[PDB]
Swiss-Prot record, chain A:
It is a single-pass membrane protein. It comes from Chlamydomonas reinhardtii (Chlamydomonas smithii). PANTHER family: PHOTOSYSTEM I REACTION CENTER SUBUNIT IX (PTHR36082:SF2), PTHR36082. This is Photosystem I reaction center subunit IX. SUPFAM superfamilies: Subunit IX of photosystem I reaction centre, PsaJ.
From Swiss-Prot, chain F:
The keyword Plastid applies. Probably participates in efficiency of electron transfer from plastocyanin to P700 (or cytochrome c553 in algae and cyanobacteria). This plastocyanin-docking protein contributes to the specific association of plastocyanin to PSI. The gene is PSAF. This is Photosystem I reaction center subunit III, chloroplastic. Belongs to the PsaF family. The lineage of its organism: Eukaryota, Viridiplantae, Chlorophyta, core chlorophytes, Chlorophyceae.
């Protein structure tokens, strides 16, 4: 389990999780606030 | 020696038997680290205690709903309380966040620093917010009748009873949720239907649980 | 000692004699801004100045706003007082702002050079007769002389108490002014009116019901 | 040393020291000593209020019939106002209760009269004051305490029996005993209700609804009314 | 030691040197002795002005119901003529009390330094200074002969009672809308239907 | 207004473009049922189109001859005519979050160079230390100007240089 957490701490897995979080956050913001251009 | 969840297999090395409810049940090895196992012990106790309190609420309100007292069913209870009283929903939710976040955060930072909430910084209280063990906070407030400091072997027996009743109430609440999602009825109405026709009214006749 | 969270670890830069002897130390730097001691000196000064001008501002909000609900002092709302006063006034607001920029910039630069060097504004010759009474009082941000006329800072057995009362009332007045701005944008009424509404119906008139502060619910 | 079950063993924290000690503690609620002092005091106070309550209900039904003790608070009348009576009871009971509680939490610290400094109450034990509270004693305290706790436990059971019999039958204790003597086979709790896995039947509540007093409209529910047999 | 609550543990800094020392401080406000000196002097001053206030509210109303320029209630004293507007009287009050108040404060700062008459420099208060307890011309009838341990205690008891009484008069007046001796006359006419709970619920 | 541009709520090609997009959506709508999911999705599309055109007309945008919103990138002209929300507030918001990312990366690099395996902490990310620096990175402009004023933001000339210089 320690080795599995080290594997999850490796670089492409963290890039995948972090870009999934960032893309989902932007997707959620563009859903609930549709089409923002200003402010 | 001790009874394992799966007879024949030895228990894992990180589950020894010192814990209450220690049956060696960790096939995914989620608690190999001792700090993660400590945190999961306390999460198990909190989920279990909320499930026991919730399941007792479900059962008592459903008894009072089948016997003609006018109690709602639990999937309509929150709506009818908010609408029949003078209660706005988001203010009661925010007050819940305040009180539960205060108490919960005291629990969090007593997990982090183990004797630190008994400093006197909360109003004047000392050693009444000191914990006894991991997830066992018995002082004068949380153990007022005082069963954890007399007859220690009987207190170990109560720890075993608490963990077993908590696991039973967690699967019972998962019960009530699944039973409602399948049948669309009150759970003690479902119990009345099973007592009416045991051989014919069940999950193999709901038409949802086995779709064949 | 006392802390903003019991059980949290106090940052190591707020646990030194120079930090523990300051005022209002409760170990609250989670963003780690005061790890640099020069930065902590500058931020001590910025906190003292924001405290004092926030107390003066919030007193100018509350005391006319409390007394305007009683008989005397027909005073407009604090978000209308600039317009009502400049209608009452004699000068345009641009000229009044220019005068206050010069008059504040002089005093501000005095304080600025005192922050840079503590024994600075007492040059013999640099002022007519100000120069003797414009040094510090061995603690920066706490001047003496014409500032503090009544001599309340002379007794040492009261001094940490006066410091800590000042830093608590200042932080609380800063919260009050951020509240004044927030309530003004959310509700549209004055803060005494907001207090009267929360006293008239607490369980229905609050920030969970204004339709602005949390719009997901 | 008689026991609640003859032949069993008492729990290890029960020896026979306190009066009324018959080794009955299945949940183990007295293994702490500091808890057991509080629960001894609470047992004595519950027992004394329940004995006075059963005496009040019995003498009330004997002396003044057609007044139902569950509704004496409703159908009583006085020029004494309800809030005035409640205020007198509030201040005087807050006084007496705080004196007794101070004697509990600090043992023997409120013995002396505050107004008349001559009169001091003698040293005693907690729960058993003595002095002017006990002017006349028949016999010895080593048996009278046992008699007091036995009569008090029996009267606590009697008071909860009065409450349940009043909510299920609607009559007083003497009238309900006359009912059970007029039909012993036909008027029991077994004879009024039963739960079978087919269907369940509970007795109708004989206490109607929210009681209309002088504008307060007191809600009057029955105790655990969905769980009766 | 007569406690406010017998049997309780009293704060250790309270020792009977103050008049009316009954060990009552649950909020521990008197830990610092400097704050305790200030609070003792402030207790004396609030108590003595409250005793004068309760006398000045009782006696005109106690004489208005029996057999005298005005029988006006105590909280309507501002709407009466008094040969002058109230602002000028405010100014006179603030000048004379600026003098007297700062003179008392200089005694409290330096004890034994505000005793002699500034204009007629032969007149003088004696050397029994005791800040808060002046003496001399302030005791013209020759009292204080008693120890004063007793008289000081009677002074602080009547003062605490009149402080509670004035907090009374403000509260009772703001609730009932009326005058306190008429409130006492209603509580004597029917105490059982006229309580605080009766009027509060009659709202 | 600015640069000969009419406001969009005054512009006519803006209204023509709104009407044209509604016309295309209703020509696609008119070949289905009422309670059908394509009709529901197209009515949600038309609702979002009307809401978008109303919000852009409400925000005070400037339209051209084509009916399209034009942005003004000049701090003084934007702050004078009420257009700071389109370039000026977005550029300070971007600089806050971009310096956030850069300062958290720089603090992670400095934290992992002080060990016996900096490349190992670069390949396998120290997640508690990275989350600690990611939460502490909110005071990055204050911390950056303090590290500037101490002379610790910058390395001296112990850098790698070529033969030429
Ligand atoms: C310190 C004790 C003290 C207390 C408890 C009061 C209390 C009161 N006075 Mg006041 N006064 C006091 C000191 C003094 N008053 C006055 C001169 C007056 C006047 C002339 C009046 C009052 C009035 C009042 C009322 C103010 C209510 C209001 O809405 O005002 C808000 C409105 C304004 C402040 C204007 C209230 C009954 C008013 C009253 O009696 O109406 C019923 C009134 O007309 N007072 C003087 C002389 C300067 C004082 C000396 O210290
Ligand atoms: C011009 C500067 C000057 C200032 C600021 C003061 C200030 C004071 N002297 Mg004064 N003095 C000054 C010059 C002189 N005094 C005196 C002789 C005295 C005497 C004899 C006394 C004072 C006292 C006082 C107080 C008067 C109380 C009052 O009126 O409150 C009015 C109310 C207000 C709200 C205004 C005050 C703020 C006040 C603190 C009195 C005092 O407090 O001594 C302990 C006092 O007894 N003065 C002489 C002649 C030697 C002076 C020479 O110019
Ligand atoms: C590099 C140039 C560039 C710029 C300046 C923009 C800018 C924008 N795009 Mg575009 N886009 C780009 C490249 C760019 N994009 C590329 C390369 C593609 C193809 C992949 C797209 C495809 C695209 C689509 C399909 C959409 C956009 C949208 C947007 C708007 C998004 C506003 C937002 O997300 O809410 C605000 C976001 C936040 C507040 C998140 C930040 C969180 C921090 C904490 C805020 C801090 C503030 C203080 C914004 C004007 C949307 C739009 O409607 O345009 C008008 C939209 O639907 N873009
Ligand atoms: C019913 C099974 C059960 C059992 C055997 C226990 C047992 C224990 N609890 Mg736990 N607890 C429970 C349910 C239970 N609890 C629930 C549902 C909650 C959430 C409200 C908690 C929250 C809780 C806290 C905060 C603490 C404990 C502690 C303890 C330990 C000592 C106290 C004691 O002996 O009470 C014995 C329990 C019983 C005899 C159960 C009574 C059954 C009731 C009367 C049923 C009817 C209730 C229903 C609403 C109607 C002991 C191991 C304390 C501790 O760990 O000290 C070191 C402690 O601080 N419990
Ligand atoms: C009114 C509350 C009350 C309290 C505080 C006590 C307290 C005590 N009892 Mg007593 N007891 C009572 C009522 C009470 N009793 C009644 C009514 C009876 C007759 C049935 C008895 C019969 C009895 C016997 C035979 C003995 C005791 C003993 C004791 C002592 C030690 C046991 C213990 O530690 O548990 C502490 C008890 C409590 C904390 C009260 C329980 C509270 C739970 C949560 C409620 C559960 C009650 C349940 C709803 C049933 C209600 C009645 C039912 C018929 C409807 C302790 C001082 C022993 C003793 O005297 O040794 C020194 C002993 O031998 N009791
Ligand atoms: C005051 C309004 C009110 C009314 C009209 C009712 C009515 C009812 N209650 Mg409820 N109850 C109430 C308040 C009320 N309750 C409160 C505040 C609590 C928390 C203490 C409860 C706890 C409670 C439980 C555990 C149960 C009921 C049950 C019932 C039903 C059967 C009667 C009964 O068992 O007595 C009421 C039960 C009591 C233990 C008495 C407490 C009620 C008094 C009035 C509380 C007053 C306190 C308040 C601060 C003043 C009946 C519909 C039973 C039911 O069928 O549920 C499904 C049941 O099992 N009640
Ligand atoms: C105080 C009221 C009361 C009364 C008079 C009864 C009476 C009865 N119950 Mg019931 N029971 C009760 C409360 C009551 N129960 C409650 C509250 C529950 C829920 C916990 C049950 C759960 C229950 C079950 C599961 C069964 C009974 C059965 C019975 C019958 C048992 C006959 C027997 O075994 O003799 C010897 C008898 C008619 C049994 C039955 O119906 O067999 C004919 C049976 O199987 N009872
Ligand atoms: C990137 C380069 C750049 C360019 C080409 C412009 C261009 C312009 N600026 Mg802008 N400006 C800029 C960046 C720039 N700006 C920056 C970074 C700031 C913040 C410091 C400003 C703050 C600003 C203000 C407050 C104002 C302008 C104005 C203008 C317009 C007229 C002034 C001029 O011709 O000076 C050429 C530009 C430069 C040499 C670049 C430096 C800009 C300096 C710092 C400010 C210049 C303001 C100027 C003195 C005001 C003239 C008043 C005008 C009525 C005559 C012109 C379109 C004015 C306007 O609104 O006109 C309608 C105006 O009032 N600018
Ligand atoms: C151990 C292990 C190990 C290995 O390694 C792996 C694995 C296997 C994965 C694991 C397992 C796991 C599991 C089984 C889990 C489960 C859980 C649960 C079910 C919970 C619940 C839990 C549950 C819970 C809390 C619950 C609670 C509840 C509540 C509160 C309720 C409430 C309510 C009420 C009263 C009534 C109203 O009207 C409504 C409501 C509001 C609704
Ligand atoms: C500490 C720390 C640390 C860590 O590390 C991190 C963190 C957390 C981030 C931090 C925190 C922070 C914070 C919270 C801050 C806040 C502040 C404030 C609130 C200020 C205000 C502040 C405020 C202020 C000054 C104010 C002032 C005011 C004034 C003058 C006023 C004026 C006025 C008046 C009279 C009236 C008229 O009619 C108008 C006007 C003109 C309007």
């Amino acid at each position: 389990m320690k080795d599995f957490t080290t594997y999850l701490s490796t670089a492409p897995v963290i890039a995948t999780i972090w870009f999934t979080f960032t893309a989902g956050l932007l997707i959620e913001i563009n859903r609930y606030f549709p089409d923002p251009l200003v402010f | 020696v001790r009874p394992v969840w799966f007879p024949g297999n030895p228990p894992p090395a990180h589950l020894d038997g010192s814990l209450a409810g220690d049956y060696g049940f960790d096939p995914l090895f989620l608690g190999q680290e001792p700090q993660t196992l400590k945190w999961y012990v306390q999460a198990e106790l909190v989920h279990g205690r909320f499930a026991m309190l919730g399941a007792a609420g479900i059962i008592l309100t459903s008894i009072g709903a089948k016997v003609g007292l006018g109690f709602p069913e639990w999937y309509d209870a929150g709506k009818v309380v908010v609408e029949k009283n003078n209660i706005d929903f988001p203010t009661l939710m925010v007050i819940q966040f305040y009180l539960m976040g205060w108490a919960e955060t005291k629990r969090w930072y007593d997990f982090k620093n183990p004797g630190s909430q008994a400093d006197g910084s909360f109003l004047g209280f000392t050693e009444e917010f000191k914990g006894l063990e991991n997830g066992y906070p018995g002082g004068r407030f949380f153990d007022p009748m005082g069963l954890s400091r007399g007859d220690a072997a009987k207190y170990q027996e109560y720890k075993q009873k608490e963990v077993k009743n908590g696991r039973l109430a967690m699967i019972a609440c998962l019960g009530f949720a699944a039973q409602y999602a399948a049948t669309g009825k009150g759970p003690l109405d479902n119990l009345a239907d099973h007592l009416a026709d045991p051989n014919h009214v069940n999950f193999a006749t709901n038409g949802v649980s086995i779709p064949i | 000692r006392q802390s903003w969270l019991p059980g949290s670890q106090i940052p190591a830069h707020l646990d030194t004699p120079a930090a523990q002897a300051l005022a209002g130390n409760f170990g609250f730097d989670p963003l780690g801004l005061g790890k640099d001691p020069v930065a902590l000196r500058w931020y001590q000064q910025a906190e003292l100045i924001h405290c004092r001008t926030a107390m003066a501002g919030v007193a100018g909000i509350l005391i006319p706003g409390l007394l305007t609900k009683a008989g005397a002092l027909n005073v407009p709302e604090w978000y209308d007082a600039g317009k009502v006063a400049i209608e009452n006034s004699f000068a345009p607001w641009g000229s009044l702002l220019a005068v206050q920029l010069f008059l504040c910039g002089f005093v501000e630069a005095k304080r600025w050079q005192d922050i840079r060097k503590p024994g600075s504004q007492g040059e013999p010759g640099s002022f007519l007769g100000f120069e003797a009474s414009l040094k510090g009082t061995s603690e920066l941000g706490y001047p003496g002389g014409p500032f503090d006329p009544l001599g309340l800072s002379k007794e040492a057995d009261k001094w940490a108490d006066w410091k800590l009362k000042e830093v608590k009332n200042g932080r609380l007045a800063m919260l009050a002014f951020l509240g004044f701005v927030a309530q003004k944008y959310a509700t549209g009424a004055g803060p005494v009116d907001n207090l009267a509404a929360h006293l008239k119906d607490p369980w229905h008139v609050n920030y969970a019901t204004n339709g602005v502060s949390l719009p997901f619910l | 040393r008689p026991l609640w079950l003859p032949g069993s063993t008492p729990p290890a924290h029960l020896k026979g020291d306190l009066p009324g000690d018959f080794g009955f503690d299945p949940l183990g609620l007295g293994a702490n000593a500091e808890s057991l002092k509080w629960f001894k005091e609470s047992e004595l106070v519950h027992s004394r209020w329940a004995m006075a309550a059963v005496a009040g209900i019995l003498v009330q039904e004997i002396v003044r019939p057609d007044v139902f003790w569950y509704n004496a608070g409703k159908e009583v009348e006085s020029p004494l106002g309800p809030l005035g009576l409640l205020a007198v009871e509030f201040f005087l009971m807050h006084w007496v209760e705080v004196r007794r509680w101070q004697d509990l939490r600090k043992p023997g610290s409120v013995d002396q009269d505050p107004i008349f400094s001559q009169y001091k109450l003698p040293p005693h034990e907690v729960g058993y004051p003595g002095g002017v509270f006990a002017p006349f004693i028949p016999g010895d305290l080593a048996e009278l305490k046992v008699k007091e706790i036995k009569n008090g436990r029996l009267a606590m059971l009697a008071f909860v029996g009065f409450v349940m019999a009043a909510q299920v039958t609607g009559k007083g204790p003497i009238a309900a005993l006359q009912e059970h003597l007029a039909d012993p086979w036909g008027t029991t709790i077994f004879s009024k209700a039963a739960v079978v896995p087919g269907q369940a039947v509970a007795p109708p509540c004989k206490i109607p609804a929210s009681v209309s007093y002088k504008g307060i409209e007191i809600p009057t529910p029955c105790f655990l009314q969905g769980l009766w047999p | 030691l007569p406690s406010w609550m017998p049997g309780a543990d009293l704060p250790g800094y309270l020792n009977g040197t103050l008049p009316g020392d009954f060990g009552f401080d649950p909020l521990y406000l008197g830990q610092d002795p400097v704050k305790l000196k200030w609070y003792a002097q402030a207790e004396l001053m609030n108590a003595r002005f409250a005793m004068l206030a309760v006398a000045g509210i009782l006696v005109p109303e106690l004489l208005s119901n029996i057999g005298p320029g005005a029988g006006v209630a105590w909280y309507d004293a501002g709407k009466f003529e008094y040969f002058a507007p109230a602002s000028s009287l405010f100014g006179v009050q603030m000048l004379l009390f600026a003098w007297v108040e700062i003179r008392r404060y200089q005694d409290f700062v330096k004890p034994g330094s505000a005793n002699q008459d500034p204009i007629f420099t032969n007149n003088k208060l004696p050397d029994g200074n005791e800040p808060g307890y002046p003496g001399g011309i302030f005791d013209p009838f020759g009292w204080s002969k008693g120890d004063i341990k007793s008289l000081k205690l009677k002074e602080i008891k009547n003062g605490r009672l009149a402080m509670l009484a004035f907090a009374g008069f403000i509260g009772q007046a703001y609730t009932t809308g009326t005058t306190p001796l008429k409130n006492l006359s209603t509580h004597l006419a029917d105490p059982w239907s006229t309580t605080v709970w009766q009027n509060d619920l009659a709202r | 207004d600015i640069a000969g541009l009419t406001p969009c709520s005054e512009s006519k090609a803006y209204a023509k473009l709104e009407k044209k997009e509604l016309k295309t959506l209703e020509k696609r709508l008119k070949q289905y049922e009422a309670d059908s999911a394509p009709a529901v999705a197209l009515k949600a599309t038309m609702e979002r189109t009307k809401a978008r055109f109303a919000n852009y007309a409400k925000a005070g945008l400037l339209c051209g001859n084509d009916g399209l919103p034009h942005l003004i990138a000049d701090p003084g002209l934007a702050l004078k005519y009420g257009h700071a929300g389109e370039v000026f507030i977005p550029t300070f918001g971007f600089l806050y979050v971009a310096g956030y990312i850069g300062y958290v990366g720089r603090q992670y690099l400095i934290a992992v160079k002080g060990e016996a395996k900096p490349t190992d902490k670069e390949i396998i990310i120290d997640v508690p230390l990275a989350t600690k620096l990611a939460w502490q990175g909110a005071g990055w402009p204050l911390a950056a100007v303090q590290e500037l004023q101490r002379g610790t933001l910058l390395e001296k000339e112990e850098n790698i240089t070529v033969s030429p210089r």
